Amino acid sequence: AIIKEFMRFKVRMEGSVNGHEFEIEGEGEGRPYEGFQTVKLKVTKGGPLPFAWDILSPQSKAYVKHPADIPDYLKLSFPEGFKWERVMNFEDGGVVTVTQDSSLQDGEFIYKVKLRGTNFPSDGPVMQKKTMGMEASSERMYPEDGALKGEDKLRLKLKDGGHYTSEVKTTYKAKKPVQLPGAYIVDIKLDITSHNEDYTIVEQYERAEGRHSTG
Numbered sequence: 001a002i003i004k005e006f007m008r009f010k011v012r013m014e015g016s017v018n019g020h021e022f023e024i025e026g027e028g029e030g031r032p033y034e035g036f037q038t039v040k041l042k043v044t045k046g047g048p049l050p051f052a053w054d055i056l057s058p059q060s061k062a063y064v065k066h067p068a069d070i071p072d073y074l075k076l077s078f079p080e081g082f083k084w085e086r087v088m089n090f091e092d093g094g095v096v097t098v099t100q101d102s103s104l105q106d107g108e109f110i111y112k113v114k115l116r117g118t119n120f121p122s123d124g125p126v127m128q129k130k131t132m133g134m135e136a137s138s139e140r141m142y143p144e145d146g147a148l149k150g151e152d153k154l155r156l157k158l159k160d161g162g163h164y165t166s167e168v169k170t171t172y173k174a175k176k177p178v179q180l181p182g183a184y185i186v187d188i189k190l191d192i193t194s195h196n197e198d199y200t201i202v203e204q205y206e207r208a209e210g211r212h213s214t215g
Contacts (some may be wrong), residue, residue, distance in 0.1 A: 002046060002104065003032050003062065003075050009109035011039070013059060015046075017096075017117035022046030028060065032075065035065025035209045038193070041202045048198035051120065054131040054156050055088070057190055057204055059098055059113050061172060064186055065209040071181045072210075073148050077174035079104045086170040088154070094120035096166075124165045131156040135163070136189040139170075141210070143180040147173040150186070186210045 006029070013024040023045035029036025037060055043049060049056075058194050061084070066072040074082050081103040087098040094117060101112045120126045135155040142149055150170045155163040194203045 002079055003026050004107070005033060007032050007062070007109060008076045008187070009039075009060060009062075009111055010063070011041075011111035011113065013056070013113040013115055015056070015113075015115040015117075017049075017055070017115075018120050018122075019045060020050055026057070030063045032062075032063045033065065035063060036091045036205070036207045037063040039204050040112055041204070042052075047200040049200075050127065051117070051127050052131040052156070053192065053195070053199045053202060054134055055094075055096055055126055055166075056115070056116060057134065057192065057202075058154065058168070059086075059100070059115060060102075060109070060111065060206070061208075062102065062109060063206070063208065066181075070184055070210050070212070071179040073174060073180055074102075074172060075179035075180055077102075077121045077176065080175040081109075082174045083102055084170055086168060088166045089166050090120070090126070091165040092121055092124050094118070094124065094126055108193040125156070125158060130159055131164060132159050133157050133189060133192055134190060139188060140183075141170075141181065141186055145178075146177060147171050148180060149202055178198040181210075183213060185213055 008029045011026040026041035028039030086098040096117045139150040139152045147190045154166040190206045
């Protein structure tokens with residue numbers, strides 16, 4: 001009974017993008033079983049960021065709605081929790097690597113994130129802030145080597161019409177070997193609900209629901 005129907009979380013990211021170091025702190029809340037959440041974030045060091053918010057926005061899988069018949073591996077991992085490791089390869093040679101620890105302390109999730117972005121063209125859409133959010137996506141989930149893997153193609157919206165593509169691969173590993181699901185799909189929509197002019201303060205909303213594959 002330790003994941004309640006309403007849960008809050010605290011997050012700190014230590015990051016570097018093309019050598020620009022920054023820190024972000026945030027707090028969020030949501031309904032883990034209903035698959036939605038919100039977060040309020042502030043850049044506490046290295047603001048304003050000289051790159052697009054949208055590469056940071058996808059950096060909280062306890063809050064995915066799962067039907068009863070798909071094991072909710074990442075909720076089962078608590079109280080100890082889980083770790084994740086991610087690579088994002090962007091279509092113009094930019095690369096983001098991320099590691100994250102998720103734990104539960106005094107009834108709140110605690111998130112610790114380390115991020116490195118490199119090889120973004122100084123004049124590309126990320127370093128020139130030409131993105132305006134991302135499309136809804138479907139993360140393709142499967143068990144492998146005792147972990148849960150996810151693969152997605154993120155389509156960052158360009159202001160000028162069009163999309164800037166990232167292939168994303170993530171490993172989500174519970175700190176104790178609770179029940180893995182079979183292969184399945186998680187439909188996700190992440191929205192930036194508000195921001196200040198320079199994106200030193202940002203609010204996000206996400207909805208996520210697991211389902212069986214069609215095909």
